[PDB]
Paper text:
As a consequence, the chain between residues 167 and 172 is only partially ordered, indicating mobility in this region of the Ω‐loop. In this variant, the peptide bond between Gly104 and Ile105 is flipped, and the gatekeeper loop moves 2.5 Å compared to the PD and PDDS variants, enlarging the active site. Mutation H184R occurred twice, in different branches of the directed evolution experiments and in both cases causes an increase in the melting temperature, suggesting, therefore, that this mutation is generally stabilizing. An Arg at position 184 could potentially form salt bridges with Glu59 and Asp63 and a cation‐π interaction with Tyr48.
BlaC is a class A serine β‐lactamase found in Mycobacterium tuberculosis (Wang et al., 2006). We analyzed the structural changes in mutants of the β‐lactamase BlaC from Mycobacterium tuberculosis obtained via directed evolution for increased ceftazidime hydrolysis activity.
Residue numbers in the entry: 29 to 83, 86 to 145, 145A, 145B, 145C, 145D, 146 to 164, 174 to 238, ...
The structure:
């Protein structure tokens, strides 16, 4: 009957929706198109930060990166302000997550190094976490795609599991906790007394994603990955944040 609710959302919003909530001691898994591929959009920036954290000592965060106008990618709300001054790796991580800053992500990819401007490094990092599905590359094409299951299991490991040592884990978690882009997505579907940390993605073809870790009022954590597109409507199909909020509401109803 929950499957029917998500299918109803697909009909109303004229969209493809993907959900995955890993099973825990207290709840069953929630899965809907959990093994179909969706575009990462900017959701890749959360594991990107994890990769950079994982492969470097903590002192690396203090490395100043200088860059030019030619390195600017997308809106870059933070990096647009620091062409003259540069930004530390830690500032870039912050901006990449909290503002989905595209220049920051570009530079963190470069910091990983390797072929494809760091995309091979990124993908290889995911492989190390047991994700054999996702890929980041240099509408239906498989480039730059993940699955709701794949990304949710990655996020679980990063935030709640032991993929990262405690100090690095806490940095990633805090940046996600202070995200500025996610108020109308998973956050909007969960009651106020639930804690939410998250990272968004948005694109053409009506693409809208949100990956989150939520905590019940009792302090019990769950991982929620919601992904959507409207590729049938072409490049100019509007992304629907409300779809993600309503999917999130269904999830919150199960977890309550």
């Amino acid at each position: 009957d929950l499957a029917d609710r998500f299918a109803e959302l697909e009909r109303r919003y004229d969209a493809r929706l993907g959900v995955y909530v890993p099973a825990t001691g207290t709840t069953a898994a929630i899965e809907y198109r959990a093994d179909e591929r969706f575009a990462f959009c900017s959701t890749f920036k959360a594991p990107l930060v994890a990769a950079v954290l994982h492969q470097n000592p903590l002192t690396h965060l203090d490395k100043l990166i200088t860059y030019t106008s030619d390195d600017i990618r997308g809106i870059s709300p933070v990096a647009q302000q620091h062409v003259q001054t540069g930004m530390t790796i830690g500032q870039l991580c912050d901006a990449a997550i909290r503002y989905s800053d595209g220049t920051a992500a570009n530079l963190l990819l470069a910091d990983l190094g390797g072929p494809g401007g760091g995309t091979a490094a990124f993908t290889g990092y995911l492989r190390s976490l047991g994700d054999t599905v996702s890929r980041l590359d240099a509408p239906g094409d498989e480039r730059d795609t993940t699955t709701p299951r794949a990304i949710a299991l990655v996020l679980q490991q990063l935030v709640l599991g032991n993929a990262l040592p405690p100090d690095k884990r806490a940095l990633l978690t805090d940046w996600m906790a202070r995200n500025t882009t996610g108020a109308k997505r998973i956050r909007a579907g969960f009651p106020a007394d639930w804690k939410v940390i998250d990272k968004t993605g948005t694109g053409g073809y009506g693409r809208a994603n949100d990956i989150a870790v939520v905590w019940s009022p009792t302090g019990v954590p769950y991982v929620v990955a919601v992904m959507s597109d409207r590729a049938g409507g072409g490049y100019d199909a509007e992304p629907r944040e409300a779809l993600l909020a309503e999917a999130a509401t269904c999830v919150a109803g199960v977890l309550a």
